[PDB]
Amino acid sequence: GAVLSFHNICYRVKLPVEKEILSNINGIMKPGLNAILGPTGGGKSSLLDVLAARKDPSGLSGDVLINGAPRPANFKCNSGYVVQDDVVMGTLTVRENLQFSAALRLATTMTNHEKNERINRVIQELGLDKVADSKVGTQFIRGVSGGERKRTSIGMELITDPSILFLDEPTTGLDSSTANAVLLLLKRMSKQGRTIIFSIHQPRYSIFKLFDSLTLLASGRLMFHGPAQEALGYFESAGYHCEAYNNPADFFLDIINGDLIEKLAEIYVNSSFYKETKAELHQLSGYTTSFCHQLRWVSKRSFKNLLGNPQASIAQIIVTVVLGLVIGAIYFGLKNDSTGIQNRAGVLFFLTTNQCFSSVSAVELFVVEKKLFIHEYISGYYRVSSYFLGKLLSDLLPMRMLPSIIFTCIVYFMLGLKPKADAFFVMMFTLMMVAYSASSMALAIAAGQSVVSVATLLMTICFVFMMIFSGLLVNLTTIASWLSWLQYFSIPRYGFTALQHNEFLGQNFCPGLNATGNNPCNYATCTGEEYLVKQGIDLSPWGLWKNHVALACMIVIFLTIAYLKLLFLKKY
Amino acid sequence: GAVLSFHNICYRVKLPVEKEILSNINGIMKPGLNAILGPTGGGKSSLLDVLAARKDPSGLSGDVLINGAPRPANFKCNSGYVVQDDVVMGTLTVRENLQFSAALRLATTMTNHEKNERINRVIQELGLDKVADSKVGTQFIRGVSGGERKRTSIGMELITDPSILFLDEPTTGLDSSTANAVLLLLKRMSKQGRTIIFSIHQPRYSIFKLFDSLTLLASGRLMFHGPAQEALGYFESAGYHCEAYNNPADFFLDIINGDLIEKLAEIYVNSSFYKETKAELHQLSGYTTSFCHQLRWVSKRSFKNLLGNPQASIAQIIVTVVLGLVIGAIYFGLKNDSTGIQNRAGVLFFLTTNQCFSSVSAVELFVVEKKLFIHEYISGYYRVSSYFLGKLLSDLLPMRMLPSIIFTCIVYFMLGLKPKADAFFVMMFTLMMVAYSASSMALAIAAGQSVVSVATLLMTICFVFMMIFSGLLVNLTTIASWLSWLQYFSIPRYGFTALQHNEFLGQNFCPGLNATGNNPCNYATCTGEEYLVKQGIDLSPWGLWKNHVALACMIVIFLTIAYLKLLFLKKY
């Protein structure tokens, strides 16, 4: 098996206040089962992220060396890593998660039969054969238990057959017998020859008896490294008395807590386990798949997540149908009189600002899947471009095509707008473009963040500053010229100007007029063009289509900013 | 000290699926330190809530009896209870929390000097004298450490000098040496003669050596009850071998988990610790303060929380000032021409719907303080009426008076609305009433819930169905008569109709007119009354003030519904 042998690791970060969180750590990890103990604030998870190259090579100041050689560039694609909180797809089943991982991690050369036999072998080794085709589980659907979610998360990284297998906290978040079952599974894996390296948090003695090698850390300094049975005898030789009926790992943490660390670290420097470790270390020292493949599998997984999550996808269509029926019931039969201007401008304003505010629920998209994106980009399933295009083609495109089609098909014929063939399609296309553009601004603000609330609030602030300049509330010509340049930034202004220019052309709003008051008395606003001029809207068809080209360019700019915020994200 | 002696407790709930979660449990708890162990799903916290009467007496089916007598009605006011997650005020300091608890729990007869000496004694017994006047801590301000927060939460219930002191999970959420310090404090309390009863979760042996009496529970059934030293010897006599270097409490849970419960519960029925317990049990068996006082202290605490939380109180005033300056900059100098109708109706619509949507941030009020309300109502600090009126007089009144005054004083004179003395005050009063009414609907929907998101979303749905019927988007006379009755439910319609009737009276919107087109040609909308009629608004002053009486009655109805949702809440 592999022998991961790290020597003289110094590590430091910038919080810019610079601080070392690993001081001087060396150790050898045999084929077998290697554990890392310590407090939360100690460097246990930091050292585990360092050995799997999950932290940036800028701060790392020592050689990490496997089997006699430094770590190659293919190492992250070769050595699996298992996150603390599970990143499995809750809506997909256990076989389809392994199908996804086998499709992206393994080569394109292999047969589907070979990958299916590999998945069957991996799901046989885990004991997930009873639940091989049930859903993993979310809030709305009941699913598989937490220990079998953790076995699924291990099995996703077992597909590529890793030589070294890392594990961040496989015990925590679980109950006791569940944790013992997971660790007995890990021991059965480690007897094969696979080198398991894991960090944990306050284990039991039934856990602690299983360990092959131990590494204790505290406040960034190495406290012990040797075989795990030898550790209690070493701390008896250090002078700390162990009491009867006490867990030795709890005794190890009780040494750290003080019933000092610079006093206790130097005691390990004067050990027999330290000179032997240096005597071993100085002996040793002195993409895969194409683009369309990644886009197809990412888009397939995200669409299957969209079907398997029924509530936030179906409920938007239900609210769209109900609100379309309500707007068809209130504005029913738009007349051509003095109320016709107010009703038509009001319903077009409601439809565009409804599209804008209903596109706030796409903040959720790149924020819920953030840790899964980081883990799967470092582990090397896909590029950022294929993730981005797959998750646009999957979750953004149909869930913004369908509500705008439903709004136009419902509120068009109940209201009785301009009864032409193409005006219907221009209205449908304008609502679809304002939906895409508002949702693309949502993705531009929301991508690469961890919380939903600040991005949602910022979207709503931007929209209430756009709807002032939309043109119903203020007249755009009466804004001062040092402030009227902000009207180009606003998406409802383009959607609403396009809909007003679509609908107000052939209409007359003075019944029985036939020039009674001599082109009626200069204050009438009778024909639709006379309204549409004094709003500041052009009458030529470029006055229609410049709104759509402005929306298309805002889609392109906002999706490019969203892509650059995903691409320049701190992945480590 | 007190001897809490419970006998033959059977307990069951309705989830309506009916299920027993405590089967047949009896035990005696001496003066000293009593622990309750078990799994999470076991009845440890349920039995601890039963003994302190924190669960309803409907499901309870056995006598709980202290010191030879059943529990009186004053018992919750006499025996302290300490919640798992701390309910201390994060913004108040450690001395002012104890000042609050001493003001509400103790009598009105006692001197302020006596209560201050009591608080000094309690804060001396805890070891909080170094941090006696520092803030407890929230997100924005750094504060006291978690163990000293837990000592503060114990000290809040130590004020009334309880005979019996309950504690739900005093170890969890903490680190190891912190937990040992808290439990050594508890042992120092229990040596005085105070009967401490607590539930915990997987303790250490340094914890477990301190116990005076033990009660193990599993799946609703009693597993052991006796002295805590005797428990391991009893389970050796049961036939379960304990291994060396193993925590006995972890061994107790490992017996439960199965390395059955109906097999293992009957073994305790055949004990020597069970017949002795029945031999002891059958021997034994066979507001404070006025209303204005509670309102004063609750309102004082909530106002001090409003000052000590600077961000969500100051940031609303900053956003109000900035948005008032923006609306003063866009709509600057409202002219009297064909754009005058559109600009005035637009800015009045923006101001009212701004008041409505900015009153969504009062959903937070009764939802953040929900567990603190339940705990302090059961422990008996205040009635529901005094909590409700204090938290209206503290957080609702000034934070909705100040933004409306700021909006009116800024956007009034920059826009140049109707330059009178009383029109300014009618505008300020209408904005204040629409703020109160929207926020009162927020409190009516939001009170008595635990999550913020569903109530916030429901507020926003109600507001977008109110703003259609406000009167700018649709003309209210052109709505069909089977649907035009919904216009009375909507708060922006009353605020916006009152502002339009306030502002559109003395205005003329046709310059240089002097009857050129013979009362100009029937389609002009020149004078303000001709606009204000065709909207459906009365011209008499009752057409102004019926909006304010509708807003006042919606304030009264919504605050009454909020009060009834607090009063009829399931407190147990």
Ligand SMILES: CC(C)C[C@H]1c2[nH]c3cc(OC4CCCC4)ccc3c2C[C@H]2C(=O)N[C@@H](CCC(=O)OC(C)(C)C)C(=O)N21
């Ligand atoms: C769809 C509608 C009922 C809610 C939608 C929405 N329209 C708005 C339109 C606005 O124009 C104003 C009308 C008069 C002048 C301007 C203003 C605000 C809004 C909002 C709020 C927004 C929201 O807060 N969230 C999303 C998704 C909510 C959702 O998913 O709801 C269910 C029940 C779970 C399905 C949304 O759709 N709205």
Ligand SMILES: CC(C)C[C@H]1c2[nH]c3cc(OC4CCCC4)ccc3c2C[C@H]2C(=O)N[C@@H](CCC(=O)OC(C)(C)C)C(=O)N21
């Ligand atoms: C104050 C404003 C900038 C935000 C406010 C608000 N106005 C609205 C007005 C609306 O009318 C439409 C305007 C054209 C016709 C109808 C519609 C929606 C809104 C919203 C959103 C609402 C909200 O989402 N909640 C609080 C946020 C306060 C807050 O805590 O944010 C800071 C920055 C941290 C202080 C709010 O006040 N807004």
Ligand SMILES: CC(C)CCC[C@@H](C)[C@H]1CC[C@H]2[C@@H]3CC=C4C[C@@H](O)CC[C@]4(C)[C@H]3CC[C@]12C
């Ligand atoms: C009438 C409206 C809603 C039509 C909108 C078009 C939608 C439904 C289309 C456009 C792009 C499509 C996706 C394109 C590519 C793939 C990859 C394939 O391996 C599974 C299907 C999947 C994920 C498609 C699902 C359906 C899809 C999202």
Ligand SMILES: CC(C)CCC[C@@H](C)[C@H]1CC[C@H]2[C@@H]3CC=C4C[C@@H](O)CC[C@]4(C)[C@H]3CC[C@]12C
């Ligand atoms: C979004 C999806 C569902 C619909 C897309 C809208 C399409 C079909 C619409 C939007 C713009 C429309 C065009 C707008 C103007 C004209 C000029 C006139 O000679 C009628 C046909 C023609 C050329 C229309 C054809 C249909 C059209 C291209």
Ligand SMILES: CC(C)CCC[C@@H](C)[C@H]1CC[C@H]2[C@@H]3CC=C4C[C@@H](O)CC[C@]4(C)[C@H]3CC[C@]12C
């Ligand atoms: C009429 C006006 C006020 C409407 C609002 C337009 C302006 C203010 C909006 C529209 C596009 C927005 C930007 C979109 C994308 C990003 C990238 C993100 O990493 C920070 C916020 C930032 C930089 C946004 C800031 C605000 C923004 C520039």
Ligand SMILES: CC(C)CCC[C@@H](C)[C@H]1CC[C@H]2[C@@H]3CC=C4C[C@@H](O)CC[C@]4(C)[C@H]3CC[C@]12C
């Ligand atoms: C990151 C954010 C700020 C990017 C915003 C880009 C905006 C401001 C740009 C992108 C596309 C642009 C439009 C493209 C084309 C035209 C037609 C021209 O005859 C008038 C200007 C107008 C209507 C532009 C206005 C400004 C515009 C909408």
Ligand SMILES: CC(C)CCC[C@@H](C)[C@H]1CC[C@H]2[C@@H]3CC=C4C[C@@H](O)CC[C@]4(C)[C@H]3CC[C@]12C
């Ligand atoms: C006119 C409107 C509807 C078109 C929609 C614009 C879409 C299709 C555009 C805008 C931003 C674009 C992305 C911008 C940057 C990159 C990085 C490049 O290495 C691969 C392509 C990729 C990922 C682009 C794919 C296509 C893209 C998503």
Ligand SMILES: CC(C)CCC[C@@H](C)[C@H]1CC[C@H]2[C@@H]3CC=C4C[C@@H](O)CC[C@]4(C)[C@H]3CC[C@]12C
């Ligand atoms: C100009 C505007 C903002 C004025 C609004 C009035 C506000 C500031 C007033 C009205 C009611 C007042 C409260 C009434 C009673 C008490 C109890 C007292 O023991 C502490 C002050 C406290 C909590 C007051 C704080 C200030 C208060 C909230």
Ligand SMILES: CC(C)CCC[C@@H](C)[C@H]1CC[C@H]2[C@@H]3CC=C4C[C@@H](O)CC[C@]4(C)[C@H]3CC[C@]12C
């Ligand atoms: C909320 C706070 C800050 C302001 C309260 C507004 C008060 C002061 C306003 C609102 C309604 C106003 C009244 C409305 C109508 C009239 C009739 C006329 O003869 C002028 C005075 C008088 C009688 C006003 C006096 C001031 C008044 C009572």
Ligand SMILES: CC(C)CCC[C@@H](C)[C@H]1CC[C@H]2[C@@H]3CC=C4C[C@@H](O)CC[C@]4(C)[C@H]3CC[C@]12C
């Ligand atoms: C113009 C119309 C559509 C405006 C909307 C008004 C109606 C639908 C609103 C206003 C007041 C609201 C109620 C206020 C209080 C409560 C009590 C709460 O426990 C359940 C919701 C419930 C029962 C709300 C339901 C919706 C409600 C009745």
Ligand SMILES: CC(C)CCC[C@@H](C)[C@H]1CC[C@H]2[C@@H]3CC=C4C[C@@H](O)CC[C@]4(C)[C@H]3CC[C@]12C
């Ligand atoms: C729980 C919710 C639904 C309660 C809502 C109560 C609403 C519908 C009630 C309470 C007060 C009422 C108003 C009280 C007084 C008047 C004056 C009268 O000349 C016309 C009706 C009008 C304007 C009422 C309309 C309906 C009204 C606003």
Ligand SMILES: CC(C)CCC[C@@H](C)[C@H]1CC[C@H]2[C@@H]3CC=C4C[C@@H](O)CC[C@]4(C)[C@H]3CC[C@]12C
């Ligand atoms: C016209 C507007 C501004 C007045 C505001 C209405 C306020 C003051 C009213 C409306 C609802 C009322 C509450 C309704 C019910 C009760 C329960 C009772 O046992 C004590 C009083 C108490 C708690 C009331 C106090 C006063 C109250 C909060």
